[PDB]
Amino acid sequence: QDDPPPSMLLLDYQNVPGIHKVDDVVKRLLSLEMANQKEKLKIKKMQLMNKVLENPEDTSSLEARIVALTVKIRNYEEHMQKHRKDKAHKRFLLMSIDQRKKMLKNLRETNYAVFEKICKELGIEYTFPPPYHRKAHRRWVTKKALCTQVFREVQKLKKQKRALRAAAVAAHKQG
Amino acid sequence: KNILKIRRRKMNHHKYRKLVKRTRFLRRKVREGRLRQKQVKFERDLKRIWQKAGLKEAPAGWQTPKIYLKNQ
RNA sequence: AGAGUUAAAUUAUAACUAAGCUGUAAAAAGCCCUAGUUAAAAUAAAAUAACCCACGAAAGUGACUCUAAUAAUCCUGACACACGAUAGCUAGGACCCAAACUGGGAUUAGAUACCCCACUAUGCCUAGCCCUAAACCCAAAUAGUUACAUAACAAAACUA
RNA sequence: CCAGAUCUUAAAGAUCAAAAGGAGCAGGUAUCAAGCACACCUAUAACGGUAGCUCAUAACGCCUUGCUCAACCACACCCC
Ligand SMILES: [K+]
Ligand SMILES: [Mg+2]
Ligand SMILES: [Mg+2]
Ligand SMILES: [Mg+2]
Ligand SMILES: [Mg+2]
Ligand SMILES: [Mg+2]
Ligand SMILES: [Mg+2]
Ligand SMILES: [Mg+2]
Ligand SMILES: [Mg+2]
Ligand SMILES: [Mg+2]
Ligand SMILES: [Mg+2]
Ligand SMILES: [Mg+2]
Ligand SMILES: [Mg+2]
Ligand SMILES: [Mg+2]
Ligand SMILES: [Mg+2]
Ligand SMILES: [Mg+2]
Ligand SMILES: [Mg+2]
Ligand SMILES: [Mg+2]
Ligand SMILES: [Mg+2]
Ligand SMILES: [Mg+2]
Ligand SMILES: [Mg+2]
Ligand SMILES: [Mg+2]
Ligand SMILES: [Mg+2]
Ligand SMILES: [Mg+2]
Ligand SMILES: [Mg+2]
Ligand SMILES: [Mg+2]
Ligand SMILES: [Mg+2]
Ligand SMILES: [Mg+2]
Ligand SMILES: [Mg+2]
Ligand SMILES: [Mg+2]
């Protein structure tokens, strides 16, 4: 997560010369104080790419787009935490995650070195798509739990059989 | 026109919705009866698992839940 | 999706006048704690603009203001994830008005219907569920062509 | 791919081919959708270690049935 400082000139009114010589009044009118959420995203996107990307001037690169989507994904999550019953934005959040997931897979199969750096910097955790998407109903999860528990119990029966029964035979040898 | 088919499907649904209402409690008895056999048959399936694995008793701490039971 | 707000109508309610007021093709029942005028919260619904055709993936949305905001450098894709009018259920709150059920009146051979009067669930807000429609523009998505050529009807025909 | 049995003989040729294995092909049914130990490593041929394997291109089940024909597969009263 990132936190743009409040008293910073917005993206556009930065490179123009002669700003620091202006009085505090105009600097206040251009800072993030008098700018809406839209201007905040620009500063987040500008800073984020300058920290992880190699060539910021390239926008068509996959890594650049993944950074752009991550900014929107974080923005949607903040909106979702406030407006919980909103369904239009929840759909956007899920589709944005799926698009980033699809683009991360494409980046991995082309440039592994860049994919590793993007995955580490942004904190994204890439999980392989599990085969055979099935709905885990109560009957299946119950029976699966029993089979795993029975499997562990069989190991204990054999493990103690390996210890005690062999020792009993070895008792005759040792005497 | 196609109304000769919608009306035929209208009458059948209207008569079925009266067969359920007239014998509502008969279906209640059968539904609960099938649910008990559904739960019992599930218990035998789990009982078969541990018996064929060589164990004598079910693993400790395992009580089979009643999945086909009314809850909320 | 949140937060704030109210123009026109209606009602509680008060004053004044009047004896009748509602209702139908025609009546009865109901009311007379009523009707007309003046003054007026709350709840609910959003004239004209709209002879415009915009936004959203669909179902949907058209009183005002502010905040947040509408995925993908722009192919296809399920039984997986998310959503889904209206009716219906569970808990709390609201209730002008409309209103299944029910009662009365009338009609009819009968009228547990159409018509008239009263009132409830409910339509509403908050939280959860249900996941159904003629969910129909009965026309699947993405690129295209006007060549070939009229079963009928309709919203002309066709290729990948 | 083929041990083994047999025949011939100058002990290396041939006939039949068990077991085991797989490029592909192989009845109906998904209202059979999950099977429940079905994997692997080390060295041992133990122990120890990892937590995996098959499956919507049909696993696991159920029903019907000799065949793809110089012929092949199976049974020899019944309890495979
Ligand atoms: K209005
Ligand atoms: Mg019928
Ligand atoms: Mg709301
Ligand atoms: Mg009267
Ligand atoms: Mg009055
Ligand atoms: Mg009131
Ligand atoms: Mg329109
Ligand atoms: Mg779309
Ligand atoms: Mg869009
Ligand atoms: Mg797609
Ligand atoms: Mg619904
Ligand atoms: Mg509703
Ligand atoms: Mg409701
Ligand atoms: Mg109930
Ligand atoms: Mg309620
Ligand atoms: Mg009410
Ligand atoms: Mg009323
Ligand atoms: Mg009556
Ligand atoms: Mg519609
Ligand atoms: Mg259809
Ligand atoms: Mg359609
Ligand atoms: Mg499609
Ligand atoms: Mg599209
Ligand atoms: Mg098209
Ligand atoms: Mg003709
Ligand atoms: Mg062989
Ligand atoms: Mg040999
Ligand atoms: Mg030999
Ligand atoms: Mg059946
Ligand atoms: Mg025999």
Report how far ligand 16's centroid is from the alpha carbon of B17 (Å): 29
CB A70 within 8 Å of CB A44: no
Contact by Cβ (8 Å): A146, B62 = yes
Closest CA to A48 of A31, A30, A27, A63: A63
The tokens describing A139, both together, are 């009957």
Closest CA to A74 of A52, A96, A55: A96
Chain centroid to CA A139: 32
**Residue A125 CA to D43 C1' — how many Å?**
38
The CA distance from A128 to A105, in Å, is 9
CB-side exposure of B60: number of CA atoms within 13 Å?
2
**CA angle (A59 as vertex; A57, A65 as ends), nearest 5:** 135
Q: Which two tokens stand for residue A16?
A: 């123009």
Residue B50: CB atoms within 10 A of its CB come to 20
Expressed in angstroms, the distance from the first to the final Cα of chain A is: 70
Bridge partners of A9?
Answer: A31
CA–CA distances in Å: residue A68 to residues A64, A74, A96: 6, 10, 11
Using CA atoms, how far apart are residues B66 and B64, in angstroms rounded to an integer?
A: 7
Q: What is the dihedral of CA A35, A38, A44, A47, to 10 degrees?
A: -80
Distance CA A45, CA B31 (A): 59
**Cα A175 to Cα A160, A168, A169, A170, A172, distances in angstroms:** 21, 10, 10, 8, 5
Tell me which residues from 145 to 164 on chain A have a beta carbon below 7 angstroms from nucleic acid strand D: 147-148, 150-151, 159, 162-163
Classify residue B70 by its DSSP letter: -
Q: How far apart are CA B69 and CA A49, in angstroms?
A: 55
> Rounded to whole angstroms, how far apart are CA atoms A38 and A75?
10
State which approach was used to obtain the coordinates: cryo-EM
From the CB of residue A10, how many other CB atoms can be counted at a distance below 10 Å?
A: 17
Of all nucleotides in the shown strands, which has a C1' nearest the CA of A94?
C82
DSSP A130: P
User: What does residue B52 show for φ and ψ, rounded to 5 degrees?
Assistant: -75, -20
Contact A66, A118 (CB under 8 A): yes
CA distance A52 to A44: 13
Instruction: Say whether the CB atom of A128 is under 7 angstroms from strand D.
Output: no
Instruction: Tell me: is residue B12 an annotated ligand-binding position.
Output: yes
